[PDB]
Amino acid sequence: QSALTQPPSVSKSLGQSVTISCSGTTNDIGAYNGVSWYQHHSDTAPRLLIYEVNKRPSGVSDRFSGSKSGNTASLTISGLQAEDEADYYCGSYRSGSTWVFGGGTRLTVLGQPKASPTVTLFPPSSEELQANKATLVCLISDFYPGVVKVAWKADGSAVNAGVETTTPSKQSNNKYAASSYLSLTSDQWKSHKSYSCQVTHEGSTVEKTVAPA
Amino acid sequence: VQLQESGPGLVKPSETLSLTCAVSGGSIGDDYYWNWIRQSPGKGLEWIGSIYGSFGGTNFNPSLKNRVTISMDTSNNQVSLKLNSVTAADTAVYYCARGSHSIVVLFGYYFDYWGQGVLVTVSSASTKGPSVFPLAPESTAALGCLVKDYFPEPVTVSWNSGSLTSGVHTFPAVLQSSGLYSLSSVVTVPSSSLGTQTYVCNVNHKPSNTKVDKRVEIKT
Protein backbone atom coordinates (compact mmCIF):
# COMPACT_ATOMS: atom_id res chain seq x y z
CA GLN A 1 0.00 0.00 0.00
CA SER A 2 2.29 2.81 1.19
CA ALA A 3 4.42 4.00 -1.70
CA LEU A 4 7.99 5.17 -1.95
CA THR A 5 7.49 8.74 -3.14
CA GLN A 6 9.80 10.26 -5.74
CA PRO A 7 9.45 13.48 -7.66
CA PRO A 8 8.03 12.46 -11.06
CA SER A 9 10.41 14.73 -12.92
CA VAL A 10 13.64 16.50 -12.19
CA SER A 11 15.84 18.76 -14.31
CA LYS A 12 19.50 19.64 -13.99
CA SER A 13 22.06 20.83 -16.57
CA LEU A 14 24.97 19.06 -18.27
CA GLY A 15 27.99 18.52 -16.05
CA GLN A 16 26.00 19.50 -12.98
CA SER A 17 25.00 17.13 -10.20
CA VAL A 18 21.41 16.14 -9.34
CA THR A 19 19.84 14.59 -6.26
CA ILE A 20 16.75 12.44 -6.51
CA SER A 21 14.92 11.75 -3.27
CA CYS A 22 12.83 8.77 -2.31
CA SER A 23 10.58 9.13 0.73
CA GLY A 24 9.64 5.89 2.38
CA THR A 25 8.55 4.80 5.82
CA THR A 26 10.05 3.43 9.00
CA ASN A 27 9.17 -0.02 7.64
CA ASP A 28 11.50 0.11 4.67
CA ILE A 29 14.11 2.83 4.26
CA GLY A 30 13.94 3.43 8.00
CA ALA A 31 14.06 -0.26 8.88
CA TYR A 32 16.97 -1.45 6.74
CA ASN A 33 20.07 -0.34 4.96
CA GLY A 34 18.41 -2.00 1.99
CA VAL A 35 17.79 0.82 -0.44
CA SER A 36 18.67 0.22 -4.06
CA TRP A 37 18.49 2.47 -7.13
CA TYR A 38 17.79 1.58 -10.75
CA GLN A 39 18.33 3.32 -14.03
CA HIS A 40 15.75 2.66 -16.70
CA HIS A 41 16.21 3.77 -20.31
CA SER A 42 13.62 3.33 -23.01
CA ASP A 43 13.44 -0.24 -24.27
CA THR A 44 16.10 -1.50 -21.86
CA ALA A 45 16.10 -3.62 -18.71
CA PRO A 46 16.27 -1.59 -15.48
CA ARG A 47 19.92 -1.23 -14.43
CA LEU A 48 21.14 -1.59 -10.83
CA LEU A 49 23.05 1.54 -9.77
CA ILE A 50 23.19 1.44 -6.00
CA TYR A 51 22.55 -1.32 -3.48
CA GLU A 52 22.56 -1.40 0.31
CA VAL A 53 22.03 2.37 0.40
CA ASN A 54 25.43 3.31 -1.02
CA LYS A 55 27.25 0.40 -2.67
CA ARG A 56 27.94 0.30 -6.41
CA PRO A 57 28.12 -2.77 -8.60
CA SER A 58 31.15 -3.05 -10.85
CA GLY A 59 30.52 -1.11 -14.04
CA VAL A 60 28.56 1.70 -12.44
CA SER A 61 30.71 4.84 -12.44
CA ASP A 62 31.40 6.69 -9.20
CA ARG A 63 29.25 9.53 -10.57
CA PHE A 64 26.42 7.67 -8.87
CA SER A 65 26.24 7.63 -5.11
CA GLY A 66 23.49 6.85 -2.65
CA SER A 67 22.67 7.90 0.87
CA LYS A 68 19.82 7.71 3.33
CA SER A 69 18.60 9.74 6.26
CA GLY A 70 15.77 8.52 8.45
CA ASN A 71 13.04 7.38 6.10
CA THR A 72 14.31 9.16 3.03
CA ALA A 73 16.91 7.91 0.56
CA SER A 74 18.77 9.83 -2.12
CA LEU A 75 20.54 9.19 -5.35
CA THR A 76 23.10 11.70 -6.47
CA ILE A 77 24.38 11.76 -10.01
CA SER A 78 27.37 14.05 -10.66
CA GLY A 79 28.84 15.14 -14.00
CA LEU A 80 25.43 14.84 -15.69
CA GLN A 81 25.72 13.48 -19.21
CA ALA A 82 23.17 13.30 -22.00
CA GLU A 83 23.29 9.54 -21.45
CA ASP A 84 21.91 10.15 -17.95
CA GLU A 85 18.45 11.03 -19.26
CA ALA A 86 16.39 8.11 -18.00
CA ASP A 87 13.94 7.06 -15.32
CA TYR A 88 15.43 6.48 -11.88
CA TYR A 89 13.74 4.27 -9.34
CA CYS A 90 14.58 3.74 -5.67
CA GLY A 91 13.36 0.63 -3.99
CA SER A 92 13.58 -1.01 -0.61
CA TYR A 93 12.90 -4.23 1.20
CA ARG A 94 9.97 -3.72 3.53
CA SER A 95 9.22 -5.17 6.95
CA GLY A 96 6.87 -8.03 6.25
CA SER A 97 9.24 -9.30 3.57
CA THR A 98 7.80 -7.36 0.65
CA TRP A 99 9.67 -5.12 -1.75
CA VAL A 100 8.60 -1.74 -2.97
CA PHE A 101 9.79 0.36 -5.88
CA GLY A 102 9.47 4.11 -5.72
CA GLY A 103 7.32 5.76 -8.40
CA GLY A 104 10.33 6.76 -10.44
CA THR A 105 11.89 10.07 -11.41
CA ARG A 106 12.33 11.07 -15.04
CA LEU A 107 15.58 12.95 -15.37
CA THR A 108 15.94 15.64 -17.98
CA VAL A 109 19.40 16.90 -18.65
CA LEU A 110 19.31 20.61 -19.40
CA GLY A 111 21.82 22.66 -21.34
CA GLN A 112 21.75 20.31 -24.32
CA PRO A 113 21.80 21.60 -27.91
CA LYS A 114 18.51 21.75 -29.75
CA ALA A 115 18.32 19.11 -32.49
CA SER A 116 15.87 19.90 -35.29
CA PRO A 117 13.88 16.97 -36.73
CA THR A 118 14.79 14.91 -39.76
CA VAL A 119 11.48 14.41 -41.60
CA THR A 120 10.94 11.61 -44.11
CA LEU A 121 7.63 11.35 -45.93
CA PHE A 122 6.51 8.32 -47.86
CA PRO A 123 3.55 8.23 -50.28
CA PRO A 124 1.37 5.13 -50.43
CA SER A 125 2.96 2.04 -51.97
CA SER A 126 1.43 0.86 -55.21
CA GLU A 127 0.54 -2.37 -53.38
CA GLU A 128 -1.46 -0.50 -50.77
CA LEU A 129 -3.14 1.53 -53.55
CA GLN A 130 -4.16 -1.68 -55.31
CA ALA A 131 -5.85 -2.54 -52.01
CA ASN A 132 -7.72 0.78 -52.35
CA LYS A 133 -5.86 2.24 -49.38
CA ALA A 134 -3.29 4.98 -49.12
CA THR A 135 -1.27 5.54 -46.00
CA LEU A 136 1.13 8.43 -46.06
CA VAL A 137 3.96 7.89 -43.62
CA CYS A 138 5.76 10.78 -41.94
CA LEU A 139 8.87 9.69 -40.06
CA ILE A 140 10.43 12.16 -37.66
CA SER A 141 13.87 11.52 -36.20
CA ASP A 142 16.87 12.91 -34.35
CA PHE A 143 15.11 15.77 -32.63
CA TYR A 144 15.64 17.17 -29.14
CA PRO A 145 13.88 18.30 -27.03
CA GLY A 146 11.32 15.58 -27.74
CA VAL A 147 8.29 17.75 -28.41
CA VAL A 148 6.76 18.13 -31.86
CA LYS A 149 3.45 18.98 -33.44
CA VAL A 150 2.56 17.22 -36.64
CA ALA A 151 0.01 18.65 -39.05
CA TRP A 152 -0.97 17.46 -42.48
CA LYS A 153 -2.07 19.35 -45.55
CA ALA A 154 -3.88 18.47 -48.77
CA ASP A 155 -3.57 20.89 -51.67
CA GLY A 156 -1.99 23.27 -49.14
CA SER A 157 -5.01 23.07 -46.86
CA ALA A 158 -5.22 21.65 -43.32
CA VAL A 159 -6.26 18.01 -43.13
CA ASN A 160 -8.73 17.56 -40.29
CA ALA A 161 -8.94 13.79 -39.94
CA GLY A 162 -7.21 10.52 -40.69
CA VAL A 163 -4.10 11.54 -38.77
CA GLU A 164 -2.53 9.44 -36.05
CA THR A 165 0.76 10.57 -34.57
CA THR A 166 3.02 8.81 -32.07
CA THR A 167 4.38 10.23 -28.85
CA PRO A 168 8.06 11.17 -29.16
CA SER A 169 10.29 8.36 -27.87
CA LYS A 170 13.97 8.28 -27.04
CA GLN A 171 16.49 7.06 -29.59
CA SER A 172 19.67 5.29 -28.52
CA ASN A 173 21.58 8.43 -29.50
CA ASN A 174 19.51 10.21 -26.79
CA LYS A 175 17.57 12.23 -29.34
CA TYR A 176 13.90 11.53 -30.01
CA ALA A 177 11.86 9.87 -32.73
CA ALA A 178 8.18 10.05 -33.63
CA SER A 179 6.01 9.13 -36.57
CA SER A 180 2.72 10.24 -38.10
CA TYR A 181 0.26 8.41 -40.37
CA LEU A 182 -2.27 9.89 -42.77
CA SER A 183 -4.69 7.07 -43.57
CA LEU A 184 -6.70 7.57 -46.77
CA THR A 185 -8.43 5.58 -49.47
CA SER A 186 -6.74 5.37 -52.86
CA ASP A 187 -9.52 7.57 -54.30
CA GLN A 188 -8.96 10.14 -51.55
CA TRP A 189 -5.24 10.14 -52.21
CA LYS A 190 -5.84 10.71 -55.90
CA SER A 191 -8.41 13.42 -55.14
CA HIS A 192 -5.73 15.99 -54.35
CA LYS A 193 -2.72 17.22 -56.30
CA SER A 194 -0.47 17.08 -53.24
CA TYR A 195 -0.24 16.20 -49.55
CA SER A 196 2.14 17.53 -46.91
CA CYS A 197 3.48 16.48 -43.56
CA GLN A 198 4.28 19.50 -41.43
CA VAL A 199 6.40 18.97 -38.33
CA THR A 200 6.76 21.83 -35.92
CA HIS A 201 9.64 21.71 -33.45
CA GLU A 202 10.82 24.54 -31.20
CA GLY A 203 8.84 27.13 -33.15
CA SER A 204 10.07 26.02 -36.56
CA THR A 205 8.58 23.82 -39.23
CA VAL A 206 9.86 21.16 -41.58
CA GLU A 207 7.35 20.28 -44.28
CA LYS A 208 7.64 17.47 -46.80
CA THR A 209 5.37 17.05 -49.80
CA VAL A 210 4.30 14.17 -52.00
CA ALA A 211 2.11 14.30 -55.11
CA PRO A 212 -0.06 11.48 -56.47
CA ALA A 213 1.46 12.34 -59.86
CA VAL B 1 24.29 -15.06 -15.31
CA GLN B 2 21.27 -14.75 -17.69
CA LEU B 3 17.48 -14.59 -17.36
CA GLN B 4 15.01 -15.11 -20.19
CA GLU B 5 11.27 -14.48 -19.86
CA SER B 6 8.68 -16.15 -22.08
CA GLY B 7 4.93 -16.50 -22.26
CA PRO B 8 1.76 -15.36 -24.05
CA GLY B 9 2.06 -11.74 -25.16
CA LEU B 10 -1.71 -11.32 -25.26
CA VAL B 11 -4.03 -12.20 -22.40
CA LYS B 12 -7.81 -11.77 -22.25
CA PRO B 13 -9.39 -9.85 -19.33
CA SER B 14 -10.21 -12.18 -16.37
CA GLU B 15 -7.89 -14.87 -17.67
CA THR B 16 -4.51 -15.78 -16.24
CA LEU B 17 -1.22 -14.30 -17.28
CA SER B 18 1.44 -17.02 -17.20
CA LEU B 19 5.13 -16.47 -17.74
CA THR B 20 8.28 -18.48 -17.35
CA CYS B 21 11.80 -17.32 -16.64
CA ALA B 22 14.53 -19.52 -18.06
CA VAL B 23 17.69 -19.03 -16.04
CA SER B 24 21.11 -19.87 -17.44
CA GLY B 25 24.58 -19.95 -15.88
CA GLY B 26 23.46 -20.46 -12.30
CA SER B 27 21.19 -22.86 -10.47
CA ILE B 28 17.69 -21.72 -9.54
CA GLY B 29 18.24 -23.65 -6.32
CA ASP B 30 21.05 -21.39 -5.16
CA ASP B 31 20.89 -18.80 -2.38
CA TYR B 32 19.05 -16.09 -4.33
CA TYR B 33 15.70 -14.43 -4.58
CA TRP B 34 14.12 -14.94 -7.99
CA ASN B 35 11.79 -12.03 -8.70
CA TRP B 36 8.97 -11.00 -10.97
CA ILE B 37 8.82 -7.30 -11.60
CA ARG B 38 6.71 -5.52 -14.17
CA GLN B 39 7.09 -2.21 -15.91
CA SER B 40 4.53 0.05 -17.51
CA PRO B 41 4.33 3.78 -18.22
CA GLY B 42 1.34 4.03 -15.88
CA LYS B 43 2.84 2.17 -12.90
CA GLY B 44 6.62 2.47 -13.30
CA LEU B 45 8.39 -0.55 -11.84
CA GLU B 46 6.31 -2.88 -9.74
CA TRP B 47 7.70 -5.74 -7.70
CA ILE B 48 5.21 -8.58 -7.99
CA GLY B 49 6.86 -11.17 -5.80
CA SER B 50 9.84 -13.42 -5.22
CA ILE B 51 10.71 -17.00 -4.52
CA TYR B 52 13.86 -17.92 -2.63
CA GLY B 53 15.90 -20.49 -4.49
CA SER B 54 17.24 -22.47 -1.53
CA PHE B 55 13.95 -23.34 0.15
CA GLY B 56 11.10 -22.05 -2.02
CA GLY B 57 9.89 -19.29 0.27
CA THR B 58 7.56 -16.90 -1.53
CA ASN B 59 6.66 -13.30 -0.84
CA PHE B 60 4.19 -11.17 -2.75
CA ASN B 61 3.23 -7.61 -3.47
CA PRO B 62 0.33 -7.10 -1.05
CA SER B 63 -1.69 -5.30 -3.77
CA LEU B 64 -1.92 -8.46 -5.84
CA LYS B 65 -0.99 -11.24 -3.41
CA ASN B 66 -4.60 -12.38 -3.78
CA ARG B 67 -4.00 -13.46 -7.38
CA VAL B 68 -0.29 -14.19 -7.82
CA THR B 69 1.44 -17.57 -7.91
CA ILE B 70 5.19 -17.95 -8.13
CA SER B 71 6.95 -21.26 -8.36
CA MET B 72 10.15 -22.81 -9.59
CA ASP B 73 11.09 -25.90 -11.51
CA THR B 74 14.53 -26.92 -10.31
CA SER B 75 14.54 -29.55 -13.07
CA ASN B 76 14.83 -27.17 -16.01
CA ASN B 77 16.03 -24.13 -14.06
CA GLN B 78 12.86 -22.15 -14.57
CA VAL B 79 10.99 -19.72 -12.37
CA SER B 80 7.34 -19.15 -13.17
CA LEU B 81 4.62 -16.60 -12.59
CA LYS B 82 0.87 -16.83 -12.71
CA LEU B 83 -1.25 -13.71 -12.34
CA ASN B 84 -4.97 -14.36 -12.64
CA SER B 85 -8.20 -12.36 -13.05
CA VAL B 86 -6.10 -10.07 -15.18
CA THR B 87 -7.26 -6.64 -16.45
CA ALA B 88 -5.93 -3.90 -18.68
CA ALA B 89 -4.24 -2.68 -15.48
CA ASP B 90 -1.89 -5.65 -15.78
CA THR B 91 -0.65 -4.71 -19.24
CA ALA B 92 3.11 -4.38 -18.79
CA VAL B 93 6.56 -5.60 -19.61
CA TYR B 94 7.19 -8.41 -17.15
CA TYR B 95 10.72 -9.04 -15.87
CA CYS B 96 12.45 -11.92 -14.18
CA ALA B 97 15.25 -10.63 -11.94
CA ARG B 98 17.74 -12.11 -9.50
CA GLY B 99 17.80 -10.79 -5.97
CA SER B 100 21.25 -10.80 -4.40
CA HIS B 101 21.72 -10.05 -0.71
CA SER B 102 24.02 -10.02 2.29
CA ILE B 103 22.18 -10.12 5.59
CA VAL B 104 18.57 -9.60 4.57
CA VAL B 105 17.23 -8.37 7.91
CA LEU B 106 19.84 -5.63 7.79
CA PHE B 107 20.33 -4.92 4.10
CA GLY B 108 17.26 -6.37 2.37
CA TYR B 109 17.96 -7.48 -1.18
CA TYR B 110 18.47 -5.96 -4.61
CA PHE B 111 18.18 -6.85 -8.28
CA ASP B 112 21.47 -7.19 -10.10
CA TYR B 113 20.56 -9.41 -13.03
CA TRP B 114 17.41 -8.91 -15.11
CA GLY B 115 15.90 -10.72 -18.04
CA GLN B 116 15.02 -8.91 -21.26
CA GLY B 117 11.38 -8.57 -20.24
CA VAL B 118 8.28 -9.80 -22.02
CA LEU B 119 5.43 -7.54 -23.07
CA VAL B 120 2.04 -8.78 -22.02
CA THR B 121 -1.01 -6.98 -23.30
CA VAL B 122 -4.28 -7.57 -21.54
CA SER B 123 -7.04 -7.18 -24.14
CA SER B 124 -10.29 -8.71 -25.41
CA ALA B 125 -9.28 -7.90 -29.01
CA SER B 126 -8.14 -10.49 -31.53
CA THR B 127 -4.62 -11.02 -32.76
CA LYS B 128 -4.11 -9.51 -36.22
CA GLY B 129 -1.11 -10.06 -38.43
CA PRO B 130 0.18 -6.97 -40.16
CA SER B 131 0.00 -6.06 -43.81
CA VAL B 132 3.53 -5.13 -44.85
CA PHE B 133 4.16 -2.53 -47.53
CA PRO B 134 7.35 -1.32 -49.13
CA LEU B 135 8.28 2.30 -48.59
CA ALA B 136 10.20 2.90 -51.79
CA PRO B 137 12.94 5.57 -51.74
CA GLU B 138 19.01 12.19 -52.70
CA SER B 139 22.66 11.37 -51.81
CA THR B 140 21.28 9.14 -49.08
CA ALA B 141 18.13 7.05 -49.59
CA ALA B 142 15.46 6.21 -47.06
CA LEU B 143 13.71 2.97 -47.86
CA GLY B 144 11.53 0.98 -45.56
CA CYS B 145 8.57 -1.15 -44.68
CA LEU B 146 5.22 -0.07 -43.39
CA VAL B 147 3.92 -2.70 -40.98
CA LYS B 148 0.24 -1.83 -41.00
CA ASP B 149 -2.70 -2.63 -38.72
CA TYR B 150 -1.50 -5.37 -36.43
CA PHE B 151 -2.30 -6.39 -32.88
CA PRO B 152 -0.80 -6.78 -30.40
CA GLU B 153 2.73 -5.53 -29.95
CA PRO B 154 5.54 -6.25 -30.47
CA VAL B 155 6.69 -6.43 -34.05
CA THR B 156 10.40 -6.92 -34.73
CA VAL B 157 12.02 -5.75 -37.93
CA SER B 158 15.49 -6.63 -39.08
CA TRP B 159 16.94 -5.92 -42.51
CA ASN B 160 18.59 -8.40 -44.85
CA SER B 161 18.40 -11.11 -42.18
CA GLY B 162 20.31 -8.90 -39.73
CA SER B 163 23.34 -8.39 -41.95
CA LEU B 164 22.20 -4.79 -42.36
CA THR B 165 22.18 -2.98 -39.03
CA SER B 166 23.82 0.34 -39.89
CA GLY B 167 21.37 3.19 -40.51
CA VAL B 168 18.42 1.01 -39.53
CA HIS B 169 15.73 2.77 -37.57
CA THR B 170 12.54 1.07 -36.45
CA PHE B 171 9.97 3.48 -35.14
CA PRO B 172 7.73 2.91 -32.16
CA ALA B 173 4.30 1.81 -33.31
CA VAL B 174 1.36 4.13 -33.62
CA LEU B 175 -1.89 2.94 -32.05
CA GLN B 176 -4.94 3.92 -34.08
CA SER B 177 -8.52 4.38 -32.90
CA SER B 178 -9.21 1.03 -34.59
CA GLY B 179 -7.17 -0.45 -31.77
CA LEU B 180 -4.63 -1.59 -34.35
CA TYR B 181 -0.92 -0.71 -34.46
CA SER B 182 1.21 0.39 -37.34
CA LEU B 183 4.95 0.89 -37.35
CA SER B 184 7.62 1.71 -39.84
CA SER B 185 11.18 0.58 -40.13
CA VAL B 186 13.44 2.45 -42.50
CA VAL B 187 17.04 1.97 -43.38
CA THR B 188 18.99 4.92 -44.65
CA VAL B 189 21.45 3.81 -47.31
CA PRO B 190 23.85 5.42 -49.78
CA SER B 191 21.76 6.00 -52.90
CA SER B 192 24.67 4.50 -54.89
CA SER B 193 23.93 1.10 -53.38
CA LEU B 194 20.33 0.99 -54.66
CA GLY B 195 21.58 -0.77 -57.78
CA THR B 196 24.03 -3.11 -56.14
CA GLN B 197 22.19 -4.11 -52.99
CA THR B 198 18.87 -5.84 -52.48
CA TYR B 199 16.94 -4.58 -49.49
CA VAL B 200 14.61 -6.90 -47.60
CA CYS B 201 12.84 -6.02 -44.37
CA ASN B 202 12.33 -9.03 -42.13
CA VAL B 203 9.15 -8.39 -40.20
CA ASN B 204 8.27 -10.69 -37.34
CA HIS B 205 4.97 -10.48 -35.52
CA LYS B 206 5.32 -13.42 -33.15
CA PRO B 207 1.82 -12.88 -31.74
CA SER B 208 0.27 -13.91 -35.09
CA ASN B 209 3.14 -16.35 -35.80
CA THR B 210 3.73 -14.34 -38.93
CA LYS B 211 7.01 -13.38 -40.59
CA VAL B 212 7.18 -11.28 -43.74
CA ASP B 213 10.36 -10.75 -45.72
CA LYS B 214 9.45 -7.84 -48.02
CA ARG B 215 11.76 -6.93 -50.88
CA VAL B 216 11.81 -3.14 -51.09
CA GLU B 217 11.74 -2.29 -54.80
CA ILE B 218 12.80 0.95 -56.42
CA LYS B 219 9.50 1.61 -58.19
CA THR B 220 8.34 2.08 -61.80
Numbering used by the authors:
A (entry chain L): 1 to 6, 8 to 27, 27A, 27B, 27C, 28 to 95, 95A, 96 to 106, ...
B (entry chain H): 2 to 35, 35A, 36 to 52, 52A, 53 to 82, 82A, 82B, 82C, ...
Sentences from the paper on this structure:
We report here the immunogenicity in rhesus macaques and CH103 CD4-binding site bnAb UCA KI mice of sequential Env immunogens derived from the CH505 HIV-1-infected individual who made the CH103 bnAb lineage. In macaques, vaccine-induced nAbs  had epitopes overlapping that of CH103, bound only open trimers, and neutralized rare tier 2 viruses. The antibody clonal lineage most similar to CH103 we identified was an IGHV4-J, CH505 differential-binding clonal lineage (DH522) with autologous tier 1, and heterologous tier 1 and weak tier 2 neutralization activities derived from memory B cells of RM-5556 immunized with additive CH505 Envs. DH522 lineage mAbs did not neutralize tier 2 CH505 TF, neutralized 7% of a panel of 199 HIV-1 primary isolates, and blocked the binding of CH103 lineage Ab (CH106) to CH505 TF gp120.
For comparison, we found that the DH522 lineage antibodies bound natively glycosylated and glycan-deleted CH505 TF gp120 Envs equally well, but did not neutralize HIV-1 pseudoviruses bearing these Envs nor bound free N-glycans.
